[PDB]
Amino acid sequence: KDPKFEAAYDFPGSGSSSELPLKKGDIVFISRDEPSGWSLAKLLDGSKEGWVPTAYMTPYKDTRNTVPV
């Protein structure tokens, strides 16, 4: 995996084991991005993995602040 993405849309899925259902605002790792328009997502705690619509995933950024750590 390793880059983080945020869900910009709910993805309820269709109840397929191959999917990873997400709510808007969910943050996941993405390991793959396929031309079919699907991305392979993994929950941050490693506990589940599955495909999600690439369309729905946007690069995660923690805060809008330019405050340094």
From Swiss-Prot:
Taxonomic superkingdom: Eukaryota
Record's comment on post-translational modification: Phosphorylation probably activates the myosin-I ATPase.
Subcellular location: Cytoplasm, Cytoskeleton, Actin patch
Domain SH3: 1-62
Family: Belongs to the TRAFAC class myosin-kinesin ATPase superfamily. Myosin family.
Extra information: Present with 155 molecules/cell in log phase SD medium.
Quaternary structure annotation from Swiss-Prot or TrEMBL: Interacts (via myosin motor domain) with SHE4; this interaction is important for proper localization and may regulate the interaction of the motor domain with actin. Interacts (via SH3 domain) with VRP1; this interaction is required for localization to sites of polarized growth and may regulate the interaction of the tail domain with actin. Interacts (via SH3 domain) with PAN1; this interaction is important for late stages of endocytopsis. Interacts (via SH3 domain) with BBC1 and LAS17. Interacts (via C-terminal acidic tail) with ARC19 and ARC40; ARC19 and ARC40 are Arp2/3 complex subunits.
Domains: entry comment: The myosin motor domain displays actin-stimulated ATPase activity and generates a mechanochemical force.
Function: One of two redundant type-I myosins implicated in the organization of the actin cytoskeleton. Required for proper actin cytoskeleton polarization and for the internalization step in endocytosis. At the cell cortex, assembles in patch-like structures together with proteins from the actin-polymerizing machinery and promotes actin assembly. Functions redundantly with LAS17 as actin nucleation-promoting factor (NPF) for the Arp2/3 complex. Motor domain phosphorylation by PAK kinases CLA4 and STE20 promotes CDC42-regulated actin assembly.
Protein name from the UniProt record: Myosin-3
Gene: MYO3
